[PDB]
Symmetry: C2
Subunit: 269 residues, 2 copies
């Protein structure tokens, strides 16, 4: 049913002529046993992906957020359970409505986070899909990519999730590696989309050289890595920098990533 | 044990714990350490991949809420990001869409959309106001072991008035700071097993088995008693199994109970509180 839901989600925004991006976020984990209480877990807070999903929404994009269950959730990740449990005080007794009050300084940007989210929900521009294991991820990724294929160039894939490279078909563990699990996979299902992959390597030289090869083989468009943020394509390389002036003003680097990618997307389209 | 790196500010954690416990002991209040969530272990230096013993922590968080409702002082040692008491009932998507907007912000929401939201905030706030709920986060096995010893030393002075409700899924394997595809993992030093009893010899110790398979839990249960010398072993089987050296109880969640909004943990707590009373 996710296949059906994602397809309607994308076709609808496609008909309004709105761009749509699949943001993957968080890490996948792989079971080691049958019952499965143990898992090899690719750590990732999901913060980058969540903040990016936020910046895409503000930039007008439709957003399909495929994310690791319990990893950072857009908007809410800025307000952990203990923060809002202690800040929100029941205002008074009501008419089907509950009333609360809180110190603005206790919940900074809370009202704006609520608005942005509710606006996206009312506009039907944000669909959230949870995955836990590599298998969940692979299945949901294909469904999302097939849902975005009809938008051709207007679809974007922002693959920030840390995808497991190894799986299991004194504790003894031996696993089988899967090379393709390093490649973006979405081009086989949505060959016309604007595809971006994230690499972990932090050496400029390695990243540029690795990305350039990966780009010629798999044919996606952009590779992003944190070195400053380095954005790499077959014929360019951009180093983004966060200005101390912007830092103090509370500007996150994901906003600039999304800004630079969105303009690249426009040219691609 | 020393072989594991100490969590950031461990000593401070030890002190905060010792004081929260002593303050409540002096009030004649029972204190329970609830462990919740799973631990994970690194396999290489500069860890970006871990072996993670999973547990959502939902039952541990729910148990903490019920213990608080029973007047216990609760020390919640839990896996960062696993279920948090009260909040776990209203995940991100739920409150982001139900809560809608002077120096003081005002909000409104259909009570229908956030059932029991108000009573949850009150229970939590009452606990914080009264100093009855201390929260300690852990992530790795190393964090857990160090913070658990601190918690044991913190509750020891309470004698039998202290309870340990050990619900966390603790890693069985690891990789030594020294001894660090096909990865081989060494067994977690058995000396760590009785860590709690060794620091709090007189406490009412209860281990909660996360498994729900009847056969598997029953045997795992009758073992934690003979060998580990815990007072009680509890597990969800639907019914709850509560085992002691001299008794085996099965508890059911009624039809009218599952209706009036009663959860099994509340029942587990009622049962454990009287056994504790008799133990004291």
């Amino acid at each position: 049913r996710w296949a059906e839901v994602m397809a309607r989600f994308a076709a609808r925004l496609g008909a309004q002529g709105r761009r749509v991006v699949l943001v993957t976020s968080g890490g996948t984990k792989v079971p080691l046993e049958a019952r499965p209480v143990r898992f090899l877990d690719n750590f990732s807070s999901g913060r980058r992906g969540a903040t990016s999903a936020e910046a895409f929404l503000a930039a007008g994009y439709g957003v399909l957020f495929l994310y690791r269950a319990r990893s950072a959730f857009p908007y809410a990740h800025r307000f952990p359970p203990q923060t809002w449990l202690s800040a929100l005080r029941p205002s008074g007794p009501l008419s089907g409505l509950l009333s609360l009050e809180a110190e603005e300084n206790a919940l900074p940007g809370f009202a704006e986070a609520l608005r942005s989210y509710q606006e996206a929900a009312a506009a039907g521009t944000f669909l959230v899909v949870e995955f836990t294991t590599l298998a969940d991820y692979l299945h949901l990724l294909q469904a999302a990519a097939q849902a975005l294929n009809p938008l051709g160039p207007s679809a974007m894939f922002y693959l920030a999730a840390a995808v497991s490279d190894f799986y299991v078909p004194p504790l003894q563990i031996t696993m089988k590696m899967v090379p393709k699990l390093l490649s973006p996979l979405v081009k086989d299902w949505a060959p016309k989309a604007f595809i971006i992959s994230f690499k972990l390597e932090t050496d400029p030289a390695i990243v540029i050289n690795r990305a350039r090869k990966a780009l010629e083989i798999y044919q996606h468009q952009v590779v992003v890595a944190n070195i400053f943020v380095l954005i790499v394509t077959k014929d360019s390389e951009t180093k983004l920098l966060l200005s101390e002036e912007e830092i103090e003003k509370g500007v996150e680097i994901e906003e600039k990533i999304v800004d630079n990618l969105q303009s690249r997307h426009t040219a691609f389209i």
